[PDB]
Amino acid sequence: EEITKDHKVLARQQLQVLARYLKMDLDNGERKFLKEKDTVAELQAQLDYLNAELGEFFVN
Amino acid sequence: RQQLQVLARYLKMDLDNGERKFLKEKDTVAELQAQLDYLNAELGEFFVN
Amino acid sequence: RQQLQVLARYLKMDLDNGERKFLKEKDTVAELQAQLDYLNAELGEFFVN
Prior knowledge:
The structure is cut from a larger assembly and holds 3 copies of chain A. The longest helix of chain A has 27 residues, at about 30-55. Helices cover about 85% and strands about 0% of the residues of chain A. Chain A is mainly alpha-helical. The N and C termini of chain A lie far apart (about 60 Å). Chain A has helices at about 1-20, 30-55, 55-60. Chain A has a single domain (about 1-55), classed as Single alpha-helices involved in coiled-coils or other helix-helix interfaces (Helix non-globular), CATH 6.10.250.1930. Chains in contact: A-B, A-C. The interface between A and B is medium-sized, with 27 and 26 residues.
């Protein structure tokens, strides 16, 4: 199992070198996703406050 | 780029997973924003604030 | 160069071992030369030869 680990580490480092040469950020998508998930929780919190204030019967 | 694609395929790593999740999250945001916008058009800003 | 560095790291090969040893040897040379120079300044060239 260690041989596979060594080869995977080498391949990952080669891919990292290639990405650095290509000037491509591999974590841009995850960064944006995490920002969007935070915006969702903010909006959900606003909606939850309005439903706790007005009630479900009124809001629906 | 093709060499990097080959390496990613060998490593079983999806390079577009983050963008896929980001686009799903952006759609959820617009849904929630639309609900909030309807409630503000119904109650008005003075009441909601 | 970065690809070659990655390959060397995978092969567990030190690329600067030779230069390290060379620099140690050059220092040993200067120590021995200094001893010889002191003995020649003490005895003189006519006696030493």
